[PDB]
Amino acid sequence: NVADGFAWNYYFGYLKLVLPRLEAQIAKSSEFRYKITKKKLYILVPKTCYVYDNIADADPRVTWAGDLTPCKINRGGIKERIYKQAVYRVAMTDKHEYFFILEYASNLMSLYDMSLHEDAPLSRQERDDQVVLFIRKLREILEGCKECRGKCEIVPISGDEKSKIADVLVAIHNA
Amino acid sequence: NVADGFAWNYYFGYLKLVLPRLEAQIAKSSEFRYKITKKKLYILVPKTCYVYDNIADADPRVTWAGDLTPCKINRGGIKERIYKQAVYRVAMTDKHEYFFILEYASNLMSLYDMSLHEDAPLSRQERDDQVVLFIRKLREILEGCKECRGKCEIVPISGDEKSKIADVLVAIHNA
Ligand SMILES: Nc1nc2c(ncn2[C@@H]2O[C@@H]3COP(=O)(O)O[C@H]4[C@@H](O)[C@H](n5cnc6c(N)ncnc65)O[C@@H]4COP(=O)(O)O[C@H]3[C@H]2O)c(=O)[nH]1
């Protein structure tokens, strides 16, 4: 399944690079080192494959707050390729605010684009199926990785949970 | 074929973002705005799927010279994700000196790591087959894209051609 390649590539090409470094990148963040309590990356996976470039456009309670210190890695001929995470602020009631290291699995944007291309390499139904398999395979990879296990949460978001991202994140935080 | 996903993803997730911006990013570069004469990106594809992080380790004539002006693009929740190309100096026996925007198709590193993993979802022999299909599919995709067609070159490199990277680049430049 094409989902298998996307899951393995998100692991080897991103999570395996950034997750073993995650606590150190947080410790270097003067703004966020003490505002992020659980040192974990939250990865949104939309079942619809609808990735939002600004997560506040999906749920306005989830607003971009800042960058973590970027990783700089020599990779594929690029000296000091920049790997950058985002911190989002979540406020559900007026009583508590939360700061999450948060992003979409952005390679899924290519699955969306594939299903729209003129030659139709992927139907919309096939795309939905592959997102399900992507979640399953990525979780299986992470569960077997000693360097990455426990440092990230895969968060599937259904189409009718678009405006509920804040609720889901705060619930998981309070597990 | 898993190679189809890698080809579509390298196109939609990278080339379609950076190639329309490449001319402006070359023009903004203080070091290379005049040294890069043809405004295009050369993509190395190793048939072995073995990517060198320093291309000079394969062909000593091809040395890292600097960064191009990086693109900043909001992407999947990341504000101003950084997309950076690399410029390589190529020095031949004629004493002629060239500067190329050059990189590996870096998602192929994941395909290599897949073939080596304890739970390898593909064999080393299937990896070879998949790199061939990646080249073919990426060519077909780029074939049909007006904004990207003239702005990049796919450069397959076999194991016994590692030390001939400079020859191929300079030959294509003089096509
Ligand atoms: N939040 C975040 N995610 C990243 C970053 N870099 C990669 N990722 C994610 O891992 C996927 C695979 O990365 P790859 O490096 O192994 O292949 C990359 C790589 O081959 C190329 N590419 C993307 N950004 C690049 C860049 N800045 N430089 C060189 N190549 C780049 O496009 C491919 C797919 O990009 P993508 O955004 O769709 O998917 C990424 C992306 O979801 C990053 O810096 N920040």
User: Position B47: which residue type?
Assistant: K
Interface check for A84 against chain B (CB to CB < 8 A): the answer is: yes
What is the structure's resolution, reported in angstroms to one decimal?
1.7
Give the residue whose CA is nearest to atom 39 of ligand 1. A107
Beta bridge partners of A103: A43
Contact B76 A121 (CB under 8 A): no
> Which of A55, A72, A101, A107 has most ligand 1 atoms within 8 Å of its beta carbon, as the pocket-test mutant?
A107
The DSSP secondary structure of A131-143, one letter per residue, reads HHHHHHHHHHHHH
Helices of type H across A28-123: 108-116
A96 vs A89: CA distance, rounded Å = 11
Contacts of B84 in chain A (CB under 8 A): 78, 80-82
A139 vs B2: CA distance, rounded Å = 19
Sign of the C-alpha dihedral computed for residues A53, A58, A59 and A60 taken in this order: positive
Domain positions in chain B are 1-37, 38-175
DSSP three-state, residue A152: strand
Contact A103 B5 (CB under 8 A): no
**Is B106 one of the annotated binding-site residues?**
yes
What experiment produced this structure?
A: X-ray
Of B2, B64, B75, the CB nearest to A53: B75
A148 vs B86: CA distance, rounded Å = 29
Q: E strand or H helix at A72, and its extent?
A: strand A71-75
Distance B76 CA to ligand 1 centre (A): 11
Query: In the 3-class helix/strand/coil scheme, how is B68-126 assigned residue by residue?
Result: CCCEEEEECCEEEEEECCEEEEEECCCCCEEEEEEEECCCHHHHHHHHHCCCCCCCHHH
A95 vs A63: CA distance, rounded Å = 17
Contacts of A4 in chain B (CB under 8 A): 2, 121
Q: What angle do CA B1, B7, B10 make, to 5 degrees?
A: 145
